[PDB]
Amino acid sequence: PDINQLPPSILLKIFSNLSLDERCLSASLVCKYWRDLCLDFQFWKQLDLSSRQQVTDELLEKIASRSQNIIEINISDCRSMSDNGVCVLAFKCPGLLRYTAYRCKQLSDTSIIAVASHCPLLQKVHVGNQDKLTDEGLKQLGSKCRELKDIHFGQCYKISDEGMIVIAKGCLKLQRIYMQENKLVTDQSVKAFAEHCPELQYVGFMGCSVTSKGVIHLTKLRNLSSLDLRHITELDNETVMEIVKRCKNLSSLNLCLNWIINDRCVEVIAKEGQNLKELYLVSCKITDYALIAIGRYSMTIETVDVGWCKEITDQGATLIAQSSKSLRYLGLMRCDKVNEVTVEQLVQQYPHITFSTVLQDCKRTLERAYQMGWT
Amino acid sequence: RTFSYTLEDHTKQAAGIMNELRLSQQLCDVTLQVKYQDAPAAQFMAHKVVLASSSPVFKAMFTNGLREQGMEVVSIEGIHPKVMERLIEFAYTASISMGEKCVLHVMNGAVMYQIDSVVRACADFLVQQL
Amino acid sequence: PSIKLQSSDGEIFEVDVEIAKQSVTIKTMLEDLGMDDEGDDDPVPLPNVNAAILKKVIQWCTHHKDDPPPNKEKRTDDIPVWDQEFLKVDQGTLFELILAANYLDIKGLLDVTCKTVANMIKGKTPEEIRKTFNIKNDFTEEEEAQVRKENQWC
């Protein structure tokens, strides 16, 4: 057996599957042949510069001037470099497909302007947090990167509806969109997104200033697979009923922190949800009737979570463990009216179901820790 | 002066060993980057289970539907890192302590994360400061 | 549909044409060679793959005959279970499978085997990698210091 007998193309392809740490701190120190192979810039392509103890700035411009053969750039964390490095990297990499840079709260909108201006083939853009992200820097991406597919703007409080509607007008291929705690973004953005981009599959407006009037417009998206509506302003039961009725491709529905979803709504969703696979109802003011309906009527739900639901009892879990054939994960987190000995009996006499309470998850973590025990 | 509040429940054994595990910096899957005005981007590491067992908002934020990569980074704003640290200490040890001038910030954080026990405690403390 | 291939050591394997179409090289030489009427189903010679490796590749392509191919996506640790169970072989067989997947142009098998080798590399110091792969350390203590000097930013 000899690895070096393989052609250099195969070895480069193998090294491409190694992280930057594992390649620079181990692979480059095996022998001079692997050193010369990993030193090559040709087959770098996707580069992950996440965190990196924030150790780069001028090196960003160095590697930008080095190679143009970059399709995905990950700049998560690492607050060291400024907008100039991002600008020159966008100048040097037009063939960029995926852009990722979470929690870079020092990057302004000049970076995203240069990005939109110097790489239109973008498909995935994840810019979580990062304050000073105005809509005027966002309409650049909305009008220039029409080939966009995935977009993430998590906790970017400096975004209103203008940039969102501009993004919705263009980028007809947008299959994913996620926004969290983004105020100033209301029903208008949701409506303009739902009626302009039928390619939408993943959508989420957690904590945004969205009401049922904007949520009901998602029925025009028969390709919706996952919907995230956690801690959202006043979502009546009828709206999500119509959502589950029309969007037949709905797989994951997230309704956490909605104090008005009742058990009749869960029953309607379980009945008319022929493709529903994951349902999250944390803090939803329901009762055991919701779980009983999920068990008796839905033959497709695998993951159901009723965490912090006050009125859930032992029977509500026992009946759904008996009557649900597709159930494999039960979210019984902080249901204080549930006895723990009952949950122990359930986990002992019900296989393929991972009952998740406080003590059960703590016990799983404690076993994973006792594998390397201490005291 | 200084106020404090201690609670005893069913997790008297699990919470302590989970706190020791947290102090060991071992098994962790949640990273909180707290930022507040001009305070540094404080970085805490913790388990999803302990944070979800004491606050429904943390549980809702941890049910994102896909946790393949294990470690998740959750940036938190509007709260001072010391307040968040005291909240995590209560979540892990069922006991919290604060200065007589930091009761309001602790109560704000607890109301933001719906921790009823320390909310009532801080309410009683703010009433007793009159 | 039926195609009869011959290995480099002299064994003949008759398989489905749609299964052999997973190999871009095989299907390309088939379209160029036997597009018109077949000459009594002449054997197709593969001089760079022996018998056992060809049999393993045929098994892998038979299990993976319904996979839908959509080229440049993110890297993960998917590697389906059956692929792992099939790749539970020695190093020689794995390297020969790599050589065949590069020769027969089987992108799925190439990806899975390269990911297996990269997982074998992952989480190991150079001293451990050299022992697990039989590679002599041609680095002097000077160059071994210079290389890690130039990569201090990790």
XYZ file of C-alpha atoms in Angstrom:
659
model
C 0.000 0.000 0.000
C 1.323 3.414 -1.057
C -0.696 6.631 -1.184
C 1.876 8.500 -3.286
C 1.236 6.059 -6.154
C -2.091 7.812 -6.750
C -2.021 10.622 -9.344
C -1.710 14.175 -7.985
C -5.286 14.924 -9.081
C -6.694 12.236 -6.777
C -4.481 13.428 -3.924
C -5.631 17.028 -4.405
C -9.249 15.841 -4.443
C -8.655 13.969 -1.179
C -6.962 16.983 0.429
C -9.901 19.170 -0.624
C -12.048 17.214 1.858
C -9.715 18.252 4.711
C -10.325 21.371 6.775
C -7.794 24.192 6.633
C -6.533 23.326 10.122
C -6.085 19.622 9.347
C -4.408 20.479 6.035
C -1.997 23.190 7.218
C -1.067 21.720 10.622
C -0.881 18.025 9.682
C -1.133 17.281 5.959
C 1.593 19.766 5.002
C 3.952 18.192 7.576
C 3.688 14.553 6.454
C 6.256 14.795 3.650
C 7.543 17.228 1.044
C 5.251 15.744 -1.617
C 2.126 16.450 0.441
C 3.665 19.826 1.317
C 3.899 20.763 -2.365
C 0.413 19.364 -3.017
C -1.337 21.259 -0.206
C 0.685 24.397 -0.992
C -0.987 24.572 -4.417
C -3.621 27.285 -4.863
C -5.265 25.761 -7.950
C -7.574 23.255 -6.221
C -8.386 25.446 -3.207
C -11.881 26.356 -4.474
C -14.013 26.369 -1.324
C -12.137 28.019 1.547
C -13.295 28.149 5.171
C -11.759 30.999 7.180
C -14.168 30.735 10.117
C -12.870 32.339 13.321
C -9.206 31.462 12.687
C -8.516 33.280 15.980
C -9.232 36.329 13.752
C -5.691 36.262 12.358
C -6.082 37.612 8.805
C -6.522 40.955 7.049
C -3.743 41.632 4.548
C -3.528 37.866 4.025
C -7.052 38.202 2.626
C -5.745 40.468 -0.137
C -2.752 38.146 -0.583
C -4.942 35.091 -1.202
C -7.286 37.203 -3.342
C -4.409 38.215 -5.620
C -3.138 34.619 -5.490
C -6.012 32.670 -7.061
C -9.261 33.523 -8.833
C -10.558 29.929 -8.625
C -12.862 30.416 -5.639
C -16.531 29.416 -5.659
C -17.384 29.614 -1.928
C -16.008 31.900 0.791
C -16.739 31.476 4.511
C -15.774 34.450 6.687
C -17.646 33.501 9.853
C -16.530 35.317 13.031
C -12.959 36.704 12.446
C -13.516 40.428 13.066
C -9.947 41.409 12.135
C -10.151 42.347 8.456
C -12.068 45.404 7.261
C -14.215 46.140 4.217
C -11.188 46.767 1.974
C -10.075 43.135 2.080
C -13.598 41.954 1.288
C -13.770 44.479 -1.560
C -10.508 43.346 -3.152
C -11.494 39.688 -2.676
C -14.752 40.395 -4.511
C -12.729 42.189 -7.194
C -10.553 39.080 -7.591
C -13.308 36.402 -7.445
C -16.204 36.941 -9.871
C -17.079 33.245 -10.008
C -18.289 33.221 -6.407
C -21.342 31.055 -5.684
C -21.640 30.948 -1.872
C -20.852 33.793 0.536
C -20.950 33.195 4.293
C -19.897 35.562 7.081
C -21.736 35.318 10.402
C -21.325 37.791 13.269
C -19.006 40.179 11.391
C -20.497 43.172 13.198
C -17.632 45.359 11.871
C -18.550 44.941 8.183
C -20.680 47.708 6.674
C -22.691 47.705 3.432
C -19.753 48.800 1.254
C -18.503 45.206 1.370
C -21.836 43.802 0.192
C -22.038 46.545 -2.456
C -18.662 45.516 -3.879
C -19.718 41.859 -3.640
C -22.939 42.473 -5.575
C -20.963 44.501 -8.119
C -18.153 41.971 -8.675
C -19.734 38.490 -8.498
C -23.242 38.077 -9.970
C -23.247 34.249 -9.954
C -24.028 34.199 -6.218
C -26.386 31.448 -5.062
C -25.942 31.360 -1.266
C -25.558 34.533 0.812
C -25.539 34.179 4.615
C -24.888 37.498 6.366
C -26.045 36.958 9.934
C -25.843 39.847 12.413
C -23.462 42.490 10.933
C -24.920 45.858 11.901
C -24.906 48.839 9.519
C -26.474 46.716 6.765
C -28.749 49.284 5.147
C -31.334 48.696 2.439
C -29.363 50.839 -0.022
C -26.531 48.327 0.193
C -29.124 45.546 -0.041
C -30.831 46.701 -3.243
C -27.420 46.249 -4.886
C -27.628 42.510 -4.190
C -31.319 42.584 -5.086
C -30.660 44.037 -8.541
C -27.273 42.468 -9.393
C -27.294 38.889 -8.038
C -30.373 37.611 -9.852
C -29.013 34.035 -9.641
C -29.488 33.929 -5.860
C -30.971 30.836 -4.217
C -30.224 30.943 -0.466
C -30.356 34.137 1.613
C -29.910 34.542 5.380
C -30.197 37.860 7.255
C -30.339 36.881 10.922
C -30.557 39.629 13.559
C -29.833 42.445 11.083
C -31.952 45.076 12.815
C -30.912 47.779 10.299
C -33.077 46.334 7.486
C -36.541 47.635 6.567
C -38.980 46.656 3.794
C -37.389 48.479 0.839
C -34.379 46.181 0.561
C -36.534 43.106 1.136
C -39.015 44.023 -1.604
C -36.128 44.812 -3.969
C -34.632 41.385 -3.212
C -38.066 39.852 -3.830
C -38.489 41.537 -7.229
C -35.290 40.018 -8.595
C -33.689 36.686 -7.719
C -36.573 34.548 -8.948
C -34.663 31.349 -8.073
C -34.651 32.072 -4.315
C -35.293 28.662 -2.756
C -34.357 29.624 0.821
C -34.880 32.713 2.980
C -34.393 33.131 6.728
C -34.750 36.219 8.918
C -34.805 36.334 12.720
C -35.742 39.158 15.122
C -35.739 41.556 12.147
C -38.056 44.409 13.044
C -39.106 46.998 10.442
C -39.765 43.999 8.163
C -43.514 43.402 8.071
C -46.252 41.765 5.987
C -45.264 43.722 2.863
C -41.924 41.933 2.502
C -43.575 38.544 3.069
C -46.255 39.256 0.462
C -43.767 40.579 -2.103
C -41.634 37.478 -1.520
C -44.482 34.960 -1.745
C -45.971 36.263 -5.016
C -42.692 36.929 -6.874
C -40.553 33.843 -6.095
C -42.504 30.591 -6.572
C -39.193 28.672 -6.209
C -39.373 29.173 -2.436
C -38.952 26.078 -0.252
C -37.468 27.244 3.075
C -38.879 30.414 4.646
C -38.658 31.880 8.140
C -39.730 35.171 9.744
C -38.985 34.539 13.415
C -39.513 37.531 15.691
C -40.301 39.830 12.770
C -43.153 42.356 12.754
C -45.328 39.987 10.717
C -49.012 39.246 11.342
C -51.481 36.758 9.874
C -52.103 39.109 6.935
C -48.598 38.425 5.632
C -48.496 34.768 6.642
C -51.654 33.948 4.672
C -49.920 35.044 1.445
C -47.599 32.016 1.698
C -50.357 29.827 0.219
C -49.193 30.947 -3.245
C -46.030 28.870 -2.627
C -47.014 25.258 -3.276
C -43.296 24.381 -3.020
C -42.990 25.341 0.660
C -41.148 22.614 2.576
C -40.172 24.264 5.883
C -41.848 27.218 7.602
C -40.466 29.040 10.657
C -42.925 31.344 12.457
C -41.582 31.513 16.013
C -42.439 34.391 18.373
C -44.392 36.128 15.614
C -47.040 38.793 16.176
C -50.507 37.242 16.490
C -50.977 34.248 14.162
C -54.550 32.981 14.338
C -55.330 29.299 13.867
C -57.171 29.727 10.559
C -54.102 31.168 8.818
C -51.837 28.217 9.609
C -54.770 25.911 8.828
C -54.941 27.374 5.317
C -51.133 27.218 5.102
C -51.108 23.482 5.830
C -54.093 22.966 3.515
C -52.648 24.735 0.459
C -48.919 24.079 0.903
C -49.112 20.290 0.586
C -45.305 19.979 0.397
C -44.960 21.348 3.944
C -42.530 19.172 5.922
C -41.335 21.269 8.890
C -43.651 23.744 10.629
C -42.346 25.897 13.485
C -44.948 27.665 15.639
C -43.038 28.154 18.897
C -43.842 31.070 21.223
C -47.313 31.558 19.701
C -49.719 31.781 22.639
C -52.858 31.561 20.458
C -52.411 28.266 18.580
C -54.862 25.805 20.153
C -55.351 22.036 19.942
C -58.107 22.204 17.311
C -55.589 23.905 15.024
C -53.097 21.106 15.684
C -55.817 18.577 14.836
C -56.597 20.336 11.547
C -52.880 20.532 10.725
C -52.367 16.832 11.480
C -55.365 15.862 9.337
C -54.677 18.070 6.302
C -50.890 17.738 6.606
C -50.164 14.713 4.432
C -46.451 15.590 4.118
C -45.876 17.072 7.583
C -42.757 15.560 9.159
C -41.667 17.984 11.913
C -43.981 20.072 14.104
C -42.719 22.391 16.854
C -45.234 23.773 19.370
C -43.056 25.068 22.211
C -44.948 27.333 24.660
C -48.117 26.944 22.562
C -51.118 27.121 24.907
C -52.498 23.686 24.025
C -53.365 20.488 25.909
C -53.206 16.706 25.545
C -55.860 16.890 22.807
C -53.255 18.172 20.335
C -50.962 15.190 20.931
C -53.911 12.780 20.813
C -54.967 14.232 17.454
C -51.396 14.039 16.131
C -51.289 10.377 17.120
C -54.712 9.381 15.801
C -54.832 11.371 12.549
C -51.295 12.131 11.301
C -49.426 9.155 9.823
C -46.367 11.200 8.782
C -45.217 13.349 11.733
C -41.871 12.109 13.066
C -40.772 15.045 15.255
C -43.247 16.779 17.573
C -42.134 19.183 20.311
C -44.487 20.579 22.957
C -41.814 22.068 25.189
C -42.869 24.366 28.034
C -46.536 23.537 27.390
C -48.181 23.859 30.793
C -51.148 21.505 30.399
C -49.378 18.436 28.961
C -49.751 15.381 31.204
C -48.754 11.707 31.245
C -51.775 10.586 29.214
C -51.047 13.109 26.462
C -47.648 11.474 25.923
C -48.754 7.869 26.480
C -51.597 8.006 23.954
C -49.400 9.607 21.296
C -46.678 7.023 21.962
C -49.296 4.295 21.469
C -51.164 5.689 18.451
C -48.454 7.399 16.351
C -46.685 5.005 13.981
C -44.266 7.537 12.452
C -43.230 9.133 15.759
C -39.529 8.901 16.619
C -38.819 12.079 18.652
C -41.101 13.417 21.388
C -40.369 16.889 22.721
C -41.586 16.739 26.326
C -39.242 19.460 27.585
C -40.269 21.175 30.841
C -43.789 19.719 30.916
C -43.904 19.882 34.698
C -47.290 18.139 34.906
C -45.587 15.019 33.472
C -44.204 12.430 35.885
C -40.636 11.306 35.238
C -41.256 7.674 36.222
C -43.886 7.534 33.474
C -41.313 8.833 30.981
C -38.863 6.188 32.203
C -41.461 3.466 31.648
C -42.113 4.903 28.178
C -38.438 4.905 27.184
C -38.175 1.352 28.536
C -41.202 -0.102 26.698
C -41.202 2.022 23.508
C -38.233 1.627 21.139
C -37.168 3.952 18.313
C -38.673 6.914 20.222
C -36.283 9.375 21.886
C -38.331 10.941 24.674
C -36.705 14.288 25.506
C -37.257 15.793 28.957
C -34.901 17.663 31.280
C -33.632 14.616 33.168
C -33.506 12.430 30.043
C -31.370 14.830 27.996
C -29.196 15.569 31.030
C -28.740 11.801 31.404
C -27.749 11.420 27.746
C -25.158 14.177 28.157
C -23.992 12.571 31.410
C -23.479 9.217 29.677
C -21.546 10.885 26.856
C -19.444 12.513 29.593
C -19.019 9.351 31.702
C -17.504 7.785 28.596
C -14.649 10.067 29.756
C -15.703 10.141 33.379
C -14.606 12.403 36.218
C -15.859 13.700 39.572
C -25.913 45.868 49.517
C -26.432 42.538 47.741
C -29.504 40.406 47.020
C -29.707 36.692 46.273
C -32.241 33.984 45.469
C -31.880 30.199 45.724
C -34.227 27.486 44.432
C -34.542 23.757 45.160
C -36.304 21.366 42.783
C -35.956 17.954 41.123
C -32.677 18.702 39.285
C -30.676 18.918 42.532
C -28.278 16.240 41.229
C -28.327 16.861 37.471
C -27.837 20.634 37.678
C -24.722 20.340 39.840
C -22.943 17.800 37.655
C -23.961 19.750 34.541
C -22.443 22.856 36.141
C -19.221 20.948 36.818
C -19.259 19.791 33.185
C -19.683 23.416 32.085
C -16.766 24.492 34.284
C -14.730 21.698 32.661
C -15.372 23.221 29.187
C -16.081 19.702 27.898
C -19.289 18.690 26.103
C -20.870 21.914 24.835
C -23.098 22.651 21.846
C -24.230 26.259 22.458
C -22.044 29.367 22.169
C -23.536 32.702 23.240
C -21.889 35.910 21.993
C -23.360 38.611 24.226
C -22.937 42.218 23.075
C -24.222 45.357 24.796
C -23.426 48.937 23.734
C -19.639 49.213 24.110
C -19.114 46.037 26.147
C -16.859 43.360 24.620
C -18.376 40.525 22.598
C -18.383 38.181 25.576
C -18.316 34.498 24.622
C -19.949 31.875 26.847
C -20.208 28.130 26.236
C -23.097 26.049 27.547
C -25.365 23.080 26.900
C -28.671 23.463 25.092
C -30.390 21.263 27.685
C -29.623 23.395 30.744
C -30.553 26.621 28.951
C -33.813 25.146 27.642
C -34.789 23.619 31.000
C -34.998 27.055 32.661
C -36.239 29.332 29.844
C -38.824 28.686 27.102
C -37.230 31.285 24.811
C -33.954 29.345 24.764
C -35.900 26.165 23.991
C -37.668 27.899 21.099
C -34.359 29.239 19.769
C -32.780 25.769 20.006
C -35.546 24.058 17.984
C -34.197 25.252 14.640
C -34.992 21.886 13.021
C -31.439 20.855 12.093
C -28.516 20.499 14.515
C -26.111 18.325 12.524
C -22.965 20.373 13.204
C -23.430 20.192 16.989
C -21.882 23.468 18.122
C -24.136 26.454 17.404
C -23.354 30.152 17.882
C -26.214 32.368 19.089
C -25.496 36.104 19.105
C -27.401 37.928 21.859
C -27.991 41.688 22.031
C -29.681 44.150 24.359
C -28.358 42.517 27.551
C -25.114 43.097 29.422
C -22.707 40.117 29.513
C -22.672 40.131 33.328
C -26.472 39.860 33.425
C -26.390 36.957 30.967
C -23.650 35.297 33.022
C -25.761 35.567 36.179
C -28.742 34.153 34.272
C -26.669 31.183 33.081
C -25.391 30.688 36.632
C -28.989 30.532 37.848
C -29.889 28.130 35.031
C -27.046 25.799 36.033
C -27.073 26.137 39.839
C -30.659 27.238 40.671
C -29.179 30.208 42.551
C -28.493 33.813 41.555
C -26.915 36.833 43.244
C -26.784 40.493 42.273
C -25.922 43.948 43.511
C -28.584 46.322 44.780
C -28.098 48.457 41.641
C -28.102 45.592 39.097
C -31.501 44.140 40.055
C -33.261 45.983 37.225
C -30.999 44.567 34.503
C -31.347 41.028 35.874
C -35.127 41.439 35.915
C -35.083 42.766 32.343
C -33.073 39.776 31.142
C -35.282 37.325 33.026
C -38.466 38.860 31.602
C -36.876 38.726 28.146
C -36.257 34.996 28.682
C -39.379 34.266 30.795
C -37.730 32.888 33.937
C -40.621 33.281 36.358
C -38.786 32.484 39.607
C -36.072 35.131 39.331
C -38.619 37.543 37.818
C -40.683 37.306 41.010
C -37.509 37.518 43.106
C -36.376 40.714 41.365
C -39.896 42.137 41.685
C -39.807 41.556 45.446
C -36.312 43.069 45.586
C -37.342 46.209 43.688
C -40.336 46.536 46.017
C -38.094 46.202 49.087
C -35.839 49.058 47.869
C -38.495 51.635 48.813
C -29.437 -4.871 -22.501
C -26.175 -6.755 -21.909
C -22.469 -5.892 -22.153
C -19.522 -8.257 -21.638
C -16.346 -6.675 -20.237
C -12.930 -8.324 -19.944
C -10.498 -7.545 -17.133
C -6.720 -7.195 -17.348
C -6.084 -10.671 -15.889
C -8.443 -12.534 -18.229
C -11.845 -12.790 -16.539
C -15.105 -11.821 -18.255
C -18.035 -10.113 -16.512
C -21.394 -9.700 -18.265
C -23.558 -6.934 -16.791
C -26.355 -4.547 -17.727
C -25.584 -1.738 -20.158
C -27.531 0.790 -18.080
C -25.437 -0.209 -15.058
C -22.191 0.195 -17.013
C -23.446 3.606 -18.189
C -22.547 4.952 -14.733
C -18.923 4.692 -15.859
C -18.428 7.633 -18.215
C -15.423 5.945 -19.840
C -17.291 2.674 -20.431
C -20.403 4.342 -21.843
C -18.318 6.711 -23.991
C -16.279 3.902 -25.543
C -19.544 1.965 -25.951
C -21.259 4.812 -27.809
C -18.207 5.343 -30.017
C -17.538 1.631 -30.587
C -20.898 -0.135 -30.599
C -23.422 2.485 -31.673
C -24.404 0.466 -34.755
C -25.160 -3.272 -34.878
C -23.157 -5.257 -32.336
C -20.547 -7.630 -33.727
C -21.812 -10.807 -32.034
C -21.412 -8.944 -28.712
C -17.652 -8.563 -28.733
C -15.979 -8.273 -25.313
C -14.882 -4.873 -24.023
C -11.307 -4.912 -22.646
C -10.352 -3.007 -19.475
C -6.548 -3.320 -19.228
C -6.212 -1.177 -16.074
C -8.622 -3.056 -13.764
C -8.216 -6.668 -12.650
C -10.972 -9.115 -11.689
C -11.653 -8.541 -7.979
C -11.628 -4.741 -8.232
C -13.919 -4.900 -11.266
C -16.271 -7.173 -9.310
C -16.307 -4.719 -6.396
C -17.013 -1.836 -8.791
C -19.835 -3.823 -10.413
C -21.338 -4.467 -6.973
C -21.129 -0.765 -6.093
C -22.702 0.325 -9.386
C -25.435 -2.299 -8.988
C -26.365 -0.962 -5.558
C -26.146 2.603 -6.911
C -28.280 2.299 -10.059
C -31.120 4.595 -8.912
C -29.133 7.579 -7.615
C -30.208 10.906 -9.172
C -27.223 13.093 -10.096
C -28.034 16.840 -9.928
C -20.839 19.143 -8.949
C -19.630 21.985 -6.692
C -21.346 21.803 -3.286
C -20.294 21.880 0.355
C -18.378 19.007 1.957
C -19.974 16.936 4.726
C -19.751 13.424 6.210
C -22.826 11.876 4.552
C -21.164 8.717 3.118
C -24.168 6.338 3.049
C -23.982 3.279 5.284
C -23.817 0.727 2.468
C -20.871 2.603 0.960
C -19.081 2.363 4.314
C -19.804 -1.362 4.656
C -18.557 -1.879 1.098
C -15.411 0.184 1.768
C -14.493 -1.938 4.820
C -11.482 -3.368 2.988
C -7.705 -3.177 3.310
C -5.604 -0.280 2.029
C -4.593 -2.027 -1.193
C -8.191 -2.701 -2.197
C -9.170 0.882 -1.342
C -6.352 2.340 -3.446
C -7.243 0.029 -6.333
C -10.881 1.138 -6.058
C -9.699 4.760 -6.147
C -7.656 4.000 -9.270
C -10.621 2.270 -10.917
C -13.072 5.064 -10.068
C -10.649 7.568 -11.579
C -10.091 5.321 -14.609
C -13.731 4.345 -15.198
C -14.747 7.956 -14.378
C -17.230 7.047 -11.642
C -17.691 10.335 -9.803
C -19.787 8.904 -6.968
C -17.360 6.104 -6.130
C -14.463 8.560 -6.441
C -16.154 10.966 -4.017
C -16.949 8.253 -1.472
C -13.464 6.711 -1.544
C -11.729 10.102 -1.379
C -13.907 11.027 1.601
C -12.961 7.738 3.270
C -9.255 8.470 2.757
C -9.699 12.035 4.037
C -11.475 10.738 7.145
C -8.516 8.394 7.586
C -6.280 11.479 7.460
C -8.518 13.546 9.762
C -7.611 13.833 13.436
C -4.043 12.531 13.143
C -0.647 14.132 13.659
C 1.913 13.766 10.838
C 3.745 11.137 12.897
C 0.525 9.097 12.994
C -0.316 9.682 9.320
C 3.138 8.506 8.235
C 2.669 5.278 10.198
C -0.883 4.648 8.971
C 0.139 5.275 5.339
C 3.815 4.145 5.320
C 5.428 7.436 4.307
C 9.021 8.265 5.210
C 9.573 11.668 6.827
C 11.867 13.354 4.305
C 11.686 16.595 6.318
C 14.814 17.752 8.079
C 14.287 19.397 11.457
C 14.921 22.725 9.700
C 12.324 22.388 6.928
C 9.943 20.716 9.393
C 10.244 23.983 11.345
C 9.966 26.325 8.341
C 6.730 24.760 7.069
C 5.007 25.138 10.440
C 6.504 28.633 10.723
C 4.798 29.723 7.498
C 1.458 28.328 8.773
C 1.351 29.866 12.259
C -2.011 31.566 11.561
C -4.225 28.524 12.208
